[PDB]
Enzyme design. Structure first.
Site, short mmCIF file in Angstrom:
data_model
loop_
_atom_site.label_atom_id
_atom_site.label_comp_id
_atom_site.label_asym_id
_atom_site.label_seq_id
_atom_site.Cartn_x
_atom_site.Cartn_y
_atom_site.Cartn_z
N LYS A 46 26.89 -56.34 -9.58
CA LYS A 46 25.60 -56.94 -9.93
C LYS A 46 24.67 -57.03 -8.73
O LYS A 46 23.75 -57.86 -8.70
CB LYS A 46 25.82 -58.32 -10.56
CG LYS A 46 26.69 -58.34 -11.81
CD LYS A 46 25.90 -57.71 -12.96
CE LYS A 46 26.36 -56.36 -13.23
NZ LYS A 46 25.53 -55.65 -14.22
N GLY A 48 22.97 -54.23 -7.43
CA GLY A 48 21.99 -53.15 -7.44
C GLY A 48 22.61 -51.78 -7.52
O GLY A 48 22.02 -50.79 -7.06
N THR A 50 23.30 -49.83 -10.16
CA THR A 50 22.62 -48.89 -11.04
C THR A 50 21.30 -48.44 -10.43
O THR A 50 20.92 -47.27 -10.53
CB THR A 50 22.36 -49.56 -12.38
OG1 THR A 50 23.60 -50.07 -12.88
CG2 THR A 50 21.82 -48.50 -13.35
N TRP A 51 20.62 -49.38 -9.80
CA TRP A 51 19.31 -49.12 -9.24
C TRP A 51 19.41 -48.09 -8.12
O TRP A 51 18.69 -47.08 -8.13
CB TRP A 51 18.71 -50.45 -8.79
CG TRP A 51 17.31 -50.43 -8.30
CD1 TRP A 51 16.38 -49.46 -8.54
CD2 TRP A 51 16.61 -51.53 -7.71
NE1 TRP A 51 15.17 -49.85 -8.01
CE2 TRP A 51 15.28 -51.11 -7.50
CE3 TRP A 51 16.99 -52.81 -7.27
CZ2 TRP A 51 14.32 -51.94 -6.89
CZ3 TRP A 51 16.04 -53.63 -6.66
CH2 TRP A 51 14.72 -53.18 -6.47
N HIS A 107 33.11 -50.57 -7.10
CA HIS A 107 32.99 -51.93 -6.62
C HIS A 107 34.16 -52.35 -5.75
O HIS A 107 34.29 -53.53 -5.44
CB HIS A 107 32.83 -52.91 -7.78
CG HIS A 107 31.66 -52.61 -8.65
ND1 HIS A 107 30.36 -52.62 -8.17
CD2 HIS A 107 31.56 -52.38 -9.98
CE1 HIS A 107 29.53 -52.33 -9.16
NE2 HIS A 107 30.23 -52.19 -10.27
N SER A 137 23.87 -63.12 -12.11
CA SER A 137 23.87 -61.84 -12.81
C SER A 137 25.26 -61.52 -13.33
O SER A 137 25.41 -61.02 -14.46
CB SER A 137 23.36 -60.75 -11.86
OG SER A 137 23.26 -59.50 -12.50
N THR A 226 12.03 -45.91 -10.91
CA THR A 226 13.08 -46.89 -10.60
C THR A 226 12.52 -48.30 -10.48
O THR A 226 13.17 -49.17 -9.89
CB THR A 226 13.86 -46.49 -9.35
OG1 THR A 226 12.98 -46.41 -8.22
CG2 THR A 226 14.51 -45.14 -9.56
N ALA A 230 10.66 -49.82 -15.65
CA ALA A 230 10.99 -48.46 -16.06
C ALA A 230 12.45 -48.33 -16.44
O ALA A 230 12.79 -47.74 -17.48
CB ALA A 230 10.63 -47.48 -14.94
#
Ligand SMILES: Nc1ncnc2c1ncn2[C@@H]1O[C@H](COP(=O)(O)O)[C@@H](OP(=O)(O)O)[C@H]1O
Ligand SMILES: Oc1ccccc1Br
Length: 293
Positions: A46, A48, A50-51, A107, A137, A226, A230
């Site tokens: 949690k 970042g 994916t970002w 992770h 998160s 990103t 979006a």
């Protein structure tokens, strides 16, 4: 067939709490065969993942959005340790049939990341996020993600989080571990709050770390695709294609809020004071620092 693994208490691997479905046949992770060209996106959950994974994949595509729309980010950037026994191929199996450069999500704490990554000198991009927002998160994530042990109440979850009992263990050990391991390995160590503050700045650093040159146009294209708004609305990155019986998107979406400081909407006055005291003790003796505002 996977159902027996979902919503179960954490297993343990090498002393670290683990998602129940991921823990069986853990030798597949221990003996994962990496390639020198592999790019590892490593995070405490949690923070970042994916970002930064979408930014990396976008850089490898020269800034073209549509090569990243063809498939969901969970297939474009597999998670190393993912498993769903009896429903899905493991992440490790999926990665074996990916062409280089493979972008690898994980992770795992640094001391249990598969030793092949260290021995091939694979580039690691680590992302840290302030512990309060991570806790928030990860609580809402466990409410919606059926792979997770149900978190019960927030006050009980926060206690487990501070004691390092949640999946992947102690946040404090996780972030300090990769911070110190850069001494013997190329690691780009990014902060979620810096990406909120100035996303184009952080894309440029990712690009340089990967040896990629970005025109002004491609940098703007990457930043445009990103943004939180979006990626929330992008079906390829918002996980809305994950089946209902695995993630209850109605409980809490993956692209939940995307800000820094949502901890203020969750920590009680008392919880905040107790966290700060404990944090200060845990984080003394490291120069690593995060921003909560
Ligand atoms: N483009 C983006 N900008 C800001 N936050 C983003 C983002 N994409 C994802 N996030 C946030 O990153 C977190 C998920 O982290 P990970 O990818 O490691 O699982 C969530 O935080 P919140 O739950 O606070 O909204 C999610 O909203
Ligand atoms: O699938 C998961 C399980 C636990 C923590 C993060 C992820 Br992503």
């Amino acid at each position: 067939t996977v159902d027996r693994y979902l919503r179960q208490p954490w297993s343990v691997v090498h002393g670290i709490p683990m998602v129940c479905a991921f823990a069986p046949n853990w030798e597949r992770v221990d003996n994962f065969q990496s390639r020198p060209e592999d790019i590892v996106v490593a995070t405490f959950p949690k923070s970042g993942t994916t970002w930064v994974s979408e930014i990396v994949d976008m850089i490898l595509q020269g800034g073209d959005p549509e090569k990243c729309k063809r498939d969901a980010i969970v297939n474009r950037v597999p998670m190393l340790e993912f498993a769903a026994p009896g429903e899905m191929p493991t992440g490790s199996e999926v990665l074996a049939t990916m062409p280089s450069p493979r972008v690898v999500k994980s992770h795992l704490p640094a001391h249990i990341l598969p030793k092949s990554f260290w021995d091939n000198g694979c580039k690691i991009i680590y992302v840290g996020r302030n512990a309060k927002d991570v806790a928030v998160s990860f609580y809402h994530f466990d409410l919606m993600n059926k792979f997770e042990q149900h978190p019960g109440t927030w006050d009980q979850y926060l206690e487990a989080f501070m004691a390092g009992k949640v999946a992947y263990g102690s946040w404090f050990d996780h972030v300090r571990g990769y911070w110190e391991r850069r001494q013997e390995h190329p690691i780009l160590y990014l902060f979620y709050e810096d990406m909120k503050e100035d996303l184009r700045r952080e894309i440029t650093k990712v690009a340089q770390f990967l040896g990629q040159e970005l025109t002004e146009v491609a940098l703007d294209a990457i930043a445009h695709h990103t943004s939180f708004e979006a990626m929330r609305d992008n079906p390829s990155t918002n996980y809305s294609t994950v089946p209902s019986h695995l993630m209850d998107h109605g409980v809490s979406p993956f692209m939940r809020k995307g800000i820094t400081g949502d901890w203020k909407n969750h920590f009680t006055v008392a919880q905040n004071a107790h966290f700060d005291q404990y944090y200060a003790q845990k984080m003394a003796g490291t120069d690593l620092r995060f921003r909560t505002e």
